[PDB]
Structure formats: C-alpha cells, structure tokens
Amino acid sequence: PDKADDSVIVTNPIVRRRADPWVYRHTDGYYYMTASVPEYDRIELRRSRTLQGLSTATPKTIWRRHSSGIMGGHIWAPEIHFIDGKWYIYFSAGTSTNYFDIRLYVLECSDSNPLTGTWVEKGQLKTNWESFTLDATTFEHNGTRYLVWAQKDPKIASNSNIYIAKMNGPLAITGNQVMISTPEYSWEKIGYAVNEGPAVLKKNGKIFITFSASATDANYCMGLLTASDTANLLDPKSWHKSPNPVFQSNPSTGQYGPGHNSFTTSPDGKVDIMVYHARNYRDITGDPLYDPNRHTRAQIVNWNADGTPDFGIPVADGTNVIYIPP
Ligand SMILES: OC[C@@H]1O[C@@H](O)[C@H](O)[C@H]1O
C-alpha cells in the first residue's frame, strides 16, 4: 500500500543494490524508477506514489537481454521517459560476443501502465559514429528536444565525453553531435579519465547538466555544466564547466563514490530532489564493476543565494526530511 503525500520524507538507502537510479514523476500521481541491477542483465521497473514508497514497491522485470547478438551483453542504466503520449526507455547495451561493446537502444510502450504494458524494441539509437556509447538522456526546451549522452571519441584519451545534439523524434538525432565536456581536471581522472551519466535540471533561467567522473569506486564524484537557457545549446562555448567537483565522497557521513544521479521533484513540483547512488564503505574487494553495493538514495537540491545549485554532501544513512510544504 503506497498512500500519497505532499511531504517528502525518506529513509536512506531507499533501494539497496540498485545503481544508476532514474526517477521520473509522471502526471498520474506516480514516481517511476529504473536502474542498473547488479547482474547487468535486465531492465526492472517499479512505481510508487511517494519517493520513500519506492523502497517497498514491487519491481517488475520488463525486459531481459537477448540470448545472442545485439542487446545480448551488459545492460546498463535505463531511463524511462514519457514523450508525446508514449513511454520510452533509453538504455545502453553490449553484445553477446562483446558484453562491453556498448551502444544506445530504445524501447517503447503505448499502454498507459508501463509495468503491465507491452514493450517493443526500437533498435539502436545511432550517433555520428560507432563507438562506446552509453548513458543517453533526453530533455526538451523551447520546443526543441535534445539528446545528451556519453561516448568514446577514438581521437581523445578518455573513456567517454559528454555530447549534445538536436533530436528528430524520440528515436533519432539530427545534425552533428557537439562535445560539451571532456576530462580535464585531476578529479575527473582518478582511476580512469571519464565523463558519463549526464543528467539535466532546468531552473532559474539556466540549464544545468551534472555528470559523473573518475572510476566507479570511492573516487566517483560529480561535476557541473551550466548554460543560459537562451543560449545556443549546440555551441560548446555556451557551456561553462565548474572547476571543482560539485559532489563527492564524505567520510564523516560514511558515503563513498556518489554519482550517476537523476533529478525529480516533490509531488507539488516545488522542490528539486537529486536521486543518486553511493556505497556506505570505502574499500572494495575484486573489480569495482561487480561490487553490487551502490545503493539508491535521495536528498534535496539546495539553491545558493545567486541561483546556482548547492548539492552539499551526501547525507548520512537514516531518516531525511526533504520537504514539508509551508
Ligand atoms: O553507466 C555505464 C557504467 O555502468 C554503470 O553500471 C555505471 O553507472 C557506469 O560506470
């Protein structure tokens, strides 16, 4: 039983053993959540009227990797969107012969309930060139839809960079893709040099895009890109990268390697809430890729006096009062 509520009060972790949390608040009174499962082998979906309710909602496996061929490798970081009356899931997948040969793919469901509904594959979402491609998100602004994602440029020594492009329908991009972020500070390079997990927040006349950098261990952290929402978002000079991490490990709250966030709101739409993953310990045994204990958690997004986002530090486990309406 998930009863609705206008206050947002959560117990972290909200969902254990789920990395890359994506939470979308729909017009039907429900939060929808997708994420990476530790086996990297399926797409699970759950819904709840409240954020905290996600801890007890029954998850459904809606899609499983192919026995062989494309979409037969790793299954990473799906995001469920609602666009033009239809559900879409953007996710990254490798092949059976190379689990790590990752491209973008899209699913679509026309039924109103996406848990019970019928899901249909729509194939790969190609970009300007074939390479390591992952973590596509989409947003709309001033009547134009965009794709923001991470991709390997063979001419650049980084696992991936952040790209933007205009879209032509929810299933394709158009034009040239534009690089708006590449690893350049040392905090983007501990372990491996990486920018990935772009996430879009629109507020205060600006478009904010957080991203994650460094390896997926305790060194994982987040940086910020900002642009004015009246600029040319395909112009790389529209995007300013904050020089320092905007979110990182905090040993005093016991939260390590936080990142790959998404953004949602309270039910009334008035506060912004960041949903992300972190571990509650520092040292990892084996390859960090198969440590399954990145846990999904949430905390409020605060706002500086000047209107830039204040992400603060990962809150300690336990209860967290995010929002009580005045
Ligand atoms: O998103 C692609 C990679 O695999 C995921 O599980 C992680 O979030 C990231 O490093």
Numbering used by the authors: 149 to 474
What do the paper's sentences say?
Here, we describe the structure and function of AtAbf43C, an uncharacterized GH family 43 subfamily 26 (GH43_26) α-L-arabinofuranosidase (EC 3.2.1.55) from A. thermocellus. We solved high-resolution crystal structures of full-length AtAbf43C and its individual carbohydrate binding module family 42 (CBM42) and GH43 domains, including a structure with L-arabinofuranose molecules bound to the CBM42. The predicted 580 amino acid protein consists of an N-terminal signal peptide (residues 1–19), a CBM42 domain (residues 29–160), a GH43 domain (residues 179–488), and a C-terminal dockerin I domain (residues 511–568). Taken together, we demonstrate through structural and functional characterization that AtAbf43C is an active arabinofuranosidase, specialized in degrading AOSs to arabinose in an exo manner.
To determine the biochemical properties of AtAbf43C, recombinant AtAbf43C (Residues 21–511, lacking the signal peptide and dockerin I domain) and truncation mutants AtAbf43C_CBM42 (Residues 21–167) and AtAbf43C_GH43 (Residues 167–494) were expressed and purified. At the optimal pH and temperature, AtAbf43C and AtAbf43C_GH43 had specific activities of 4.95 ± 0.28 U/mg and 5.67 ± 0.63 U/mg, respectively, on pNPAra, while AtAbf43C_CBM42 showed no activity on pNPAra, with U defined as mM/s of released pNP. This confirmed that AtAbf43C_GH43 contained the active catalytic domain. The catalytic GH43 domain displays the five-bladed β-propeller fold typical of GH43 enzymes. The GH43 domain of AtAbf43C does not have a C-terminal β-jelly roll domain found in some subfamilies of GH43 proteins; however, the N-terminal strand of the domain appears to form part of the fifth blade in the blade V structure in what is colloquially termed a ‘molecular velcro’. This closure in the structure, thought to provide extra structural stability, is not found in many GH43 enzymes in which the fifth blade in the beta propeller only consists of residues found in the C-terminal strand. In AtAbf43C, these residues were identified to be D168, D283, and E344, found closely grouped at the base of the beta propeller structure. The topology of this binding pocket, characteristic of exo-acting GH43 enzymes, is such that the three catalytic residues are positioned at the bottom of a deep, narrow opening that sterically limits access to larger or branched substrates. When overlaid with the apo structure of the AtAbf43C GH43 domain, the bound arabinose and arabinobiose from SaAraf43A fit neatly within the surface structure of the AtAbf43C-binding pocket, suggesting AtAbf43C maybe be active on similar AOS substrates as SaAraf43A.
